[PDB]
JSON list of C-alpha atoms in Angstrom, two decimals:
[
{"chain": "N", "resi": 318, "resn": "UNK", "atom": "CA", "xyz": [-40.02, -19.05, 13.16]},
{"chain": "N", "resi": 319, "resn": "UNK", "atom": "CA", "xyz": [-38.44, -15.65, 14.41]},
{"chain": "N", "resi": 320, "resn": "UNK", "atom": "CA", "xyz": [-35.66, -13.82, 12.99]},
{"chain": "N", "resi": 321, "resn": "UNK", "atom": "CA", "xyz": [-34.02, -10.88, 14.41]},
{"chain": "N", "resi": 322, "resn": "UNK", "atom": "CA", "xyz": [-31.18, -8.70, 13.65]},
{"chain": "N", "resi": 323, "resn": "UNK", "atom": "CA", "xyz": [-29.32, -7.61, 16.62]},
{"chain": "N", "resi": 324, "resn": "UNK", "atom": "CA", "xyz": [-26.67, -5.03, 16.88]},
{"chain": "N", "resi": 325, "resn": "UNK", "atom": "CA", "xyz": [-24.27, -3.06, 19.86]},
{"chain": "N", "resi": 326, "resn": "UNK", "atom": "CA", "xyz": [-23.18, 0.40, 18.45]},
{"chain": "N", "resi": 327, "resn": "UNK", "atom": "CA", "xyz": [-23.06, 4.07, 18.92]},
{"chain": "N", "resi": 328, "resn": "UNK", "atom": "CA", "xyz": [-23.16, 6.97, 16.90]},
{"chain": "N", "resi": 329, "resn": "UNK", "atom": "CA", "xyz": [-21.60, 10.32, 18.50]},
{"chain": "N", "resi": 330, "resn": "UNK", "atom": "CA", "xyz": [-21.01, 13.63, 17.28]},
{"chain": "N", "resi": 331, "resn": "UNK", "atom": "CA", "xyz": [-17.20, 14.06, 18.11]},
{"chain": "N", "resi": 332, "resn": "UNK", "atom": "CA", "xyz": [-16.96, 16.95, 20.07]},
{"chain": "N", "resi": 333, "resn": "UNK", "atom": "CA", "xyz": [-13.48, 17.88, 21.72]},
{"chain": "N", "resi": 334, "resn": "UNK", "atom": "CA", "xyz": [-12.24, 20.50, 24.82]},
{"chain": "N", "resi": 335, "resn": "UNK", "atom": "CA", "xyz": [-10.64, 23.90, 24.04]},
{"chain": "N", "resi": 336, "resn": "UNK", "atom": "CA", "xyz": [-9.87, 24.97, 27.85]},
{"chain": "N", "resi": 337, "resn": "UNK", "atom": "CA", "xyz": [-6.92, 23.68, 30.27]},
{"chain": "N", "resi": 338, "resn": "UNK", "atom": "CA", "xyz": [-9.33, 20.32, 31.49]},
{"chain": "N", "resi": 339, "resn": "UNK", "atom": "CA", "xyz": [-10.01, 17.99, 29.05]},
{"chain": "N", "resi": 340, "resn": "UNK", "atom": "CA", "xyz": [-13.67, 18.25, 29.10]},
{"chain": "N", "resi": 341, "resn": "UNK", "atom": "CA", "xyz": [-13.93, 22.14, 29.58]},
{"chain": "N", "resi": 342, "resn": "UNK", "atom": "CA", "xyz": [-15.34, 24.19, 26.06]},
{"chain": "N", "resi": 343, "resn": "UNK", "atom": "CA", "xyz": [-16.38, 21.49, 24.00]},
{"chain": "N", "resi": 344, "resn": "UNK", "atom": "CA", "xyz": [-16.34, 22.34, 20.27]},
{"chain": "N", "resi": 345, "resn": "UNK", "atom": "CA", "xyz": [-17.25, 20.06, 17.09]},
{"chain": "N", "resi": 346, "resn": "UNK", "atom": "CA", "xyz": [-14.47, 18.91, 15.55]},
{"chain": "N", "resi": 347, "resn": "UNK", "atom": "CA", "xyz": [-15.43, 18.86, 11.78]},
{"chain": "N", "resi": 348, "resn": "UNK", "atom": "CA", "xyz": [-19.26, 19.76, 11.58]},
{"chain": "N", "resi": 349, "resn": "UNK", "atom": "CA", "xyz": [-20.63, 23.45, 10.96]},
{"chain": "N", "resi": 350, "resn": "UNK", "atom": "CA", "xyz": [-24.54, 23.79, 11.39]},
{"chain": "N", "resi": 351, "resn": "UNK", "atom": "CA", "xyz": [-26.25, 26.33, 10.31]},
{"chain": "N", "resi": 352, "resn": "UNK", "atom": "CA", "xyz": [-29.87, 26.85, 10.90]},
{"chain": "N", "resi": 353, "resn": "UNK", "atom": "CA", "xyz": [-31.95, 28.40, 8.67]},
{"chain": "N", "resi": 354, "resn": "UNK", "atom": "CA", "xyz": [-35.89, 29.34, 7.50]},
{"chain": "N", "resi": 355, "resn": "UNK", "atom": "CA", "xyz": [-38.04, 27.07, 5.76]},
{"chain": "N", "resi": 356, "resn": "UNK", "atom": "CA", "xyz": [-41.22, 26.76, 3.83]},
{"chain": "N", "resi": 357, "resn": "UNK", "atom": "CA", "xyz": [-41.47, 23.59, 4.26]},
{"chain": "N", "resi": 358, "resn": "UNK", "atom": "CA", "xyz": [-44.24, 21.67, 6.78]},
{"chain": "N", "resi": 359, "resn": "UNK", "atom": "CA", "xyz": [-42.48, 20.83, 10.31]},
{"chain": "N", "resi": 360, "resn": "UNK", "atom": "CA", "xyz": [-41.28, 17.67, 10.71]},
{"chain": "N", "resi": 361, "resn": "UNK", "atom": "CA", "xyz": [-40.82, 17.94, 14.34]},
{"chain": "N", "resi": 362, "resn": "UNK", "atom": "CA", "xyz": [-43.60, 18.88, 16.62]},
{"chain": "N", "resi": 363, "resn": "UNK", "atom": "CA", "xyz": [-43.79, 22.51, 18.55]},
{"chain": "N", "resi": 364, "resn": "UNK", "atom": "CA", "xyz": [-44.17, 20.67, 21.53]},
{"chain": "N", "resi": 365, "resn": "UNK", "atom": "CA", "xyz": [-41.17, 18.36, 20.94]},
{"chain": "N", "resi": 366, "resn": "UNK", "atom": "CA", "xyz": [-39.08, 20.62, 19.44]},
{"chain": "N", "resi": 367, "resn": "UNK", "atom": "CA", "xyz": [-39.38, 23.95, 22.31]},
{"chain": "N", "resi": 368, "resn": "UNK", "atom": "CA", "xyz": [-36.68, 24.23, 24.96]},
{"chain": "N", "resi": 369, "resn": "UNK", "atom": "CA", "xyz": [-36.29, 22.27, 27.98]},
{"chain": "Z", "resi": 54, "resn": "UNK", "atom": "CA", "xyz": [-17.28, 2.50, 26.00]},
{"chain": "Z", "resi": 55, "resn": "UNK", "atom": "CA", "xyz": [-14.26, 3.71, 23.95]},
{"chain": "Z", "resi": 56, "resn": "UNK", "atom": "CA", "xyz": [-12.20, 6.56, 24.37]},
{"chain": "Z", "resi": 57, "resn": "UNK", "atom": "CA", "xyz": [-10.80, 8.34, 21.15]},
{"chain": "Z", "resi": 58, "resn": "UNK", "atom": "CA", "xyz": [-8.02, 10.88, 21.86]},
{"chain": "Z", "resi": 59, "resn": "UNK", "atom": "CA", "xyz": [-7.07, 13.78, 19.56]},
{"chain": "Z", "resi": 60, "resn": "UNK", "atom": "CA", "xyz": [-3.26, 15.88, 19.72]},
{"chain": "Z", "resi": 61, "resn": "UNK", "atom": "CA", "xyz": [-3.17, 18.96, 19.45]},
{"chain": "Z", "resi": 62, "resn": "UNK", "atom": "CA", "xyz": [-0.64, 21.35, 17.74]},
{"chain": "Z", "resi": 63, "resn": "UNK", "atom": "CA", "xyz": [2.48, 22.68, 18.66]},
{"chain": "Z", "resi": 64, "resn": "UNK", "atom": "CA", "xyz": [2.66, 26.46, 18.43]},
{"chain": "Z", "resi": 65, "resn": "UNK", "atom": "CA", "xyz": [6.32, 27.29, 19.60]},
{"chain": "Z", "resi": 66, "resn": "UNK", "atom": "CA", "xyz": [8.72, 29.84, 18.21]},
{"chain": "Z", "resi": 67, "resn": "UNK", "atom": "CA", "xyz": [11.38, 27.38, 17.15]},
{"chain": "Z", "resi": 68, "resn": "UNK", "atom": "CA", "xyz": [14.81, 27.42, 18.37]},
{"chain": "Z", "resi": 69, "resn": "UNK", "atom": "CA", "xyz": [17.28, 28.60, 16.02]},
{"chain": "Z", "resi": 70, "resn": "UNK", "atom": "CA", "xyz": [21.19, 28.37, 16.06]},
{"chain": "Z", "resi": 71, "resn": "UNK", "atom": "CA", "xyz": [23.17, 26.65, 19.31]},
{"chain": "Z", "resi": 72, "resn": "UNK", "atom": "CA", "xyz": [20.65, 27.70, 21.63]},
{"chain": "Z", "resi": 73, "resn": "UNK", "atom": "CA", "xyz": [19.59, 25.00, 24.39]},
{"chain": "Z", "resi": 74, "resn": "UNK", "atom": "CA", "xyz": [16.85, 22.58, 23.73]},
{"chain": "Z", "resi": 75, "resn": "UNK", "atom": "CA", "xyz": [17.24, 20.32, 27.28]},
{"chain": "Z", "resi": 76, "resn": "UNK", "atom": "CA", "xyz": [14.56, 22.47, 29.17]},
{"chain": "Z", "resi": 77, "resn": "UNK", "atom": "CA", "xyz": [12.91, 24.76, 26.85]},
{"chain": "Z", "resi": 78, "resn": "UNK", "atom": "CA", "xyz": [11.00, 21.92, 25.64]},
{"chain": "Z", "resi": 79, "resn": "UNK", "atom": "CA", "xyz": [7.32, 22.16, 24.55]},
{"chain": "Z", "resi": 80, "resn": "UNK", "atom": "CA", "xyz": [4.08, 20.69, 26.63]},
{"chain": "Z", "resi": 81, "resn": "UNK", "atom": "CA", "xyz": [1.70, 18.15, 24.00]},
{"chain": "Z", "resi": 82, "resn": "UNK", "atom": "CA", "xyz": [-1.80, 19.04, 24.88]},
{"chain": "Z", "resi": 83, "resn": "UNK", "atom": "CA", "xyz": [-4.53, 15.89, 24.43]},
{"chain": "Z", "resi": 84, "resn": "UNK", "atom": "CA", "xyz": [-8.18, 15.31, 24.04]},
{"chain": "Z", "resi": 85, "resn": "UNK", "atom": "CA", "xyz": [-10.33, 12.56, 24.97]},
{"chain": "Z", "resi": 86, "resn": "UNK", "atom": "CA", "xyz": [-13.74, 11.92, 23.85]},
{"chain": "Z", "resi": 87, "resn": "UNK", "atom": "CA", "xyz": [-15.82, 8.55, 25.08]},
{"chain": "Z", "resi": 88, "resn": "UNK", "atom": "CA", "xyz": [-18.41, 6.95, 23.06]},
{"chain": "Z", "resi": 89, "resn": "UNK", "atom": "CA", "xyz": [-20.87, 4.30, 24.55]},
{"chain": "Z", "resi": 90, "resn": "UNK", "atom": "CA", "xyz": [-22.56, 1.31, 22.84]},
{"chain": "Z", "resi": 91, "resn": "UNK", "atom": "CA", "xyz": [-25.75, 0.18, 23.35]},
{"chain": "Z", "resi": 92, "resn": "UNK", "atom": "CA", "xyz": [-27.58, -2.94, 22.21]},
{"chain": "Z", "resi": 93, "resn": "UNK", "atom": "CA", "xyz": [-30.71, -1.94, 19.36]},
{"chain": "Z", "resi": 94, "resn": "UNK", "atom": "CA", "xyz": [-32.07, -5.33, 17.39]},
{"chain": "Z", "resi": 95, "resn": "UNK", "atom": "CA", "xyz": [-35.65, -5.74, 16.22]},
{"chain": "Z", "resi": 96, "resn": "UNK", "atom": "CA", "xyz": [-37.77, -9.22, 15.41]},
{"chain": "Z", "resi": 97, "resn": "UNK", "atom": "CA", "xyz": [-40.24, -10.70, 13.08]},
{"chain": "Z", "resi": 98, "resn": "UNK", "atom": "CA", "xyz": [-42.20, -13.78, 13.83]},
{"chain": "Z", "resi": 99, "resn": "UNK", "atom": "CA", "xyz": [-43.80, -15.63, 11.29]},
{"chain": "Z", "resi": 100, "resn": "UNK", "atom": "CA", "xyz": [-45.78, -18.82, 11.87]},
{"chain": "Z", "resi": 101, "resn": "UNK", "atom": "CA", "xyz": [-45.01, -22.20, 10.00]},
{"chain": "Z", "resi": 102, "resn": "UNK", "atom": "CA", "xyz": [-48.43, -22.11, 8.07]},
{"chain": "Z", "resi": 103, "resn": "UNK", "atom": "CA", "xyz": [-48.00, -18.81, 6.63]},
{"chain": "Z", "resi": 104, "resn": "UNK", "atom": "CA", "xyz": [-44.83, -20.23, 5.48]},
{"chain": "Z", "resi": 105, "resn": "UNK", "atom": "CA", "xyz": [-46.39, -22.78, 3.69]},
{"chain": "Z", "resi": 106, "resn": "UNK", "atom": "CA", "xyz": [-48.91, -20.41, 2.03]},
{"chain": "L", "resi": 2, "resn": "UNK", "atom": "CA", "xyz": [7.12, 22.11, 29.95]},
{"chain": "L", "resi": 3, "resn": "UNK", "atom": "CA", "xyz": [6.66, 18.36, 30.55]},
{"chain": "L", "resi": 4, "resn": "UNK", "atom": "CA", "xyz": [3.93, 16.25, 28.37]},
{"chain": "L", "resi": 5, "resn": "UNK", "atom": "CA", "xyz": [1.21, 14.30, 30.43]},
{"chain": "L", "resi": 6, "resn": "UNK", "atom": "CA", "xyz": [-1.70, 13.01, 29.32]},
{"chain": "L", "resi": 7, "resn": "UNK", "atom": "CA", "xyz": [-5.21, 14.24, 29.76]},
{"chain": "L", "resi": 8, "resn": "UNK", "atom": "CA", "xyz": [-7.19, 13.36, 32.41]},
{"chain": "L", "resi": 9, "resn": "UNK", "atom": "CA", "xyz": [-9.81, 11.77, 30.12]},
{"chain": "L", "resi": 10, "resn": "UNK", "atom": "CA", "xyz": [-6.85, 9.57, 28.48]},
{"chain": "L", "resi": 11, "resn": "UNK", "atom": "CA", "xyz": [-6.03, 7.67, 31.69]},
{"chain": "L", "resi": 12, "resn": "UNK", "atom": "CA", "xyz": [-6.44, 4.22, 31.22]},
{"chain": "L", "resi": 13, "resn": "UNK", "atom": "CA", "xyz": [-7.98, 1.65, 34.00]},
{"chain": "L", "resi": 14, "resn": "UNK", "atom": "CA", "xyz": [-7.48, -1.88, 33.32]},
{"chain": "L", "resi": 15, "resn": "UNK", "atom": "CA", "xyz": [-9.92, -4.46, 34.69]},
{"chain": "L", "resi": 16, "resn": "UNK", "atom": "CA", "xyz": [-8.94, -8.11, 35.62]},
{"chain": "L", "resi": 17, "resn": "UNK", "atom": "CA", "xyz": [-10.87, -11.12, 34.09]},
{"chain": "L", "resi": 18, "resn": "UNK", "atom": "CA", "xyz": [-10.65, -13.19, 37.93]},
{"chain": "L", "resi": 19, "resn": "UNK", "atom": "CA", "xyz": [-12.83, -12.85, 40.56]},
{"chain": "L", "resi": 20, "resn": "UNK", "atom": "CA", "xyz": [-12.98, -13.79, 44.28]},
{"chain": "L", "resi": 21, "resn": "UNK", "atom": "CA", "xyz": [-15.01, -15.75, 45.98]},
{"chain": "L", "resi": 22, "resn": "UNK", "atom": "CA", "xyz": [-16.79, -15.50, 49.36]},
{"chain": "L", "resi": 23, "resn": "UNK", "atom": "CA", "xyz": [-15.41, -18.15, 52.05]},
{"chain": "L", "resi": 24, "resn": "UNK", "atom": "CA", "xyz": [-18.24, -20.86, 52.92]},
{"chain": "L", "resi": 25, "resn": "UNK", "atom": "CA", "xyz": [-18.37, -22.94, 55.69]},
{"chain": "L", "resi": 26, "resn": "UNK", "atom": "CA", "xyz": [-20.26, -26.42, 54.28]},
{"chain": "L", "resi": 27, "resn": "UNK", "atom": "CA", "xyz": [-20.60, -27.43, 57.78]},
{"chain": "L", "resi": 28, "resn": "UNK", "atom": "CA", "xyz": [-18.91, -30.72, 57.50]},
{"chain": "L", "resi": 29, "resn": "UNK", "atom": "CA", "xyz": [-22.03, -32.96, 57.46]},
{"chain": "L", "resi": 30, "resn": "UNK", "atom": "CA", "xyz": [-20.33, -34.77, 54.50]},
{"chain": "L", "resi": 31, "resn": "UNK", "atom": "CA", "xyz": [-17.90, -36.93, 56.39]},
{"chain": "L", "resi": 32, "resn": "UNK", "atom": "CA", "xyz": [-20.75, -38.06, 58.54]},
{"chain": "L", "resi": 33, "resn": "UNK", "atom": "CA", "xyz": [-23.04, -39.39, 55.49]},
{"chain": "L", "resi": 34, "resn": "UNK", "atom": "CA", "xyz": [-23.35, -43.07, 55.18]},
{"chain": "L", "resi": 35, "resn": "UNK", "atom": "CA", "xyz": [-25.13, -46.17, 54.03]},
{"chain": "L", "resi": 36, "resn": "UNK", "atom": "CA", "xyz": [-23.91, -48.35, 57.47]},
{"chain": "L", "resi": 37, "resn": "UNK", "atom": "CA", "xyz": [-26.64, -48.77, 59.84]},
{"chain": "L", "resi": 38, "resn": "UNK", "atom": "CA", "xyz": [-24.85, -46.95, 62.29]},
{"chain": "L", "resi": 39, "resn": "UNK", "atom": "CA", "xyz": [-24.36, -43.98, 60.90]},
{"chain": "L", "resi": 40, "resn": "UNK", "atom": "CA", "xyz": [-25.34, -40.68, 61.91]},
{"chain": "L", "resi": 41, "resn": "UNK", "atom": "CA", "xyz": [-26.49, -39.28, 58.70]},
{"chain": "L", "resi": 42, "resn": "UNK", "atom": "CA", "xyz": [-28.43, -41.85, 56.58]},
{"chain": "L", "resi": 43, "resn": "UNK", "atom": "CA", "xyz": [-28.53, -41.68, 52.97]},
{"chain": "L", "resi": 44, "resn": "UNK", "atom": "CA", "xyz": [-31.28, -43.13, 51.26]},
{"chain": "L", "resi": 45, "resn": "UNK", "atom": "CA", "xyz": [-30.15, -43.68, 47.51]},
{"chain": "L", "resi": 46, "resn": "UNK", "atom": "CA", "xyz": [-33.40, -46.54, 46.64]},
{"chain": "L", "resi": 47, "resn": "UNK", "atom": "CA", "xyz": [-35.69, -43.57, 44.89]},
{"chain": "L", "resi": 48, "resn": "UNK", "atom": "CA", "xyz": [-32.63, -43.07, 42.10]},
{"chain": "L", "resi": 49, "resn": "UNK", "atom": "CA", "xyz": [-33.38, -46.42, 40.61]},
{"chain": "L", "resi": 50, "resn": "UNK", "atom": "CA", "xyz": [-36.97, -46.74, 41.60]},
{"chain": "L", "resi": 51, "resn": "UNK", "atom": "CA", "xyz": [-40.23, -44.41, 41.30]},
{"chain": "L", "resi": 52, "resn": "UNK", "atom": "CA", "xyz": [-42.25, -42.88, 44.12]},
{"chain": "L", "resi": 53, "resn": "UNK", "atom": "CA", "xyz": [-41.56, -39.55, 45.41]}
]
């Protein structure tokens, strides 16, 4: 017997234009990050988490 | 996909007394922002003996 | 100024018909037959009988 839960969805961060096109500067609409130091151990890896 | 849109504000100096309206009228700027679905579903299969167990 | 909307908010609409390539089906059908004469026989005995 196999049960599986199945689902179609998607989860975006809604980001809108500021320039004359309508994809041009995209800012966030409602969300403010700030990043910030911690003492705590990393949860994602060096490798994973370096640019590019 | 689904495209949400988002209307922006109107920042005109508004016109005051009998002044004409007909062609100083303002531009409504619009954003669009599309989303895509995708299918994610996971299983478990369990035999009819375990079941019984 | 005039009010258009943005390039991103131009809607497509997409139609639930759909053509279908042209086939020739050679017209063999109108010479299928069970008469002894005819030029296409059809053999119909293995429907009702086994042996391949």
């Amino acid at each position: 017997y196999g049960v599986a839960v199945d689902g179609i969805y998607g989860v975006r961060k809604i980001i809108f234009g500021s320039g004359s096109g309508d994809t041009d500067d995209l800012k966030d609409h409602g969300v403010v990050t700030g990043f910030f130091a911690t003492t705590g151990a990393a949860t994602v890896a060096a490798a994973a988490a370096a640019e590019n | 996909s689904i495209t949400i849109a988002l209307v922006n504000r109107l920042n005109n100096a508004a016109v005051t007394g009998a002044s004409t309206l007909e062609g100083n009228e303002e531009d409504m700027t619009s954003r669009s922002l599309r989303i895509y679905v995708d299918k994610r579903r996971n299983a478990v299969r369990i035999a009819e003996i375990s079941e019984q167990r | 100024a005039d009010t258009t909307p943005a390039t991103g908010l131009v809607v497509q609409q997409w139609e639930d018909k759909f053509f279908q390539e042209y086939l020739h089906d050679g017209g063999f059908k109108a010479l299928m037959g069970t008469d002894e004469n005819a030029v296409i026989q059809v053999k119909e005995d293995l429907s009702k009988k086994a042996g391949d």
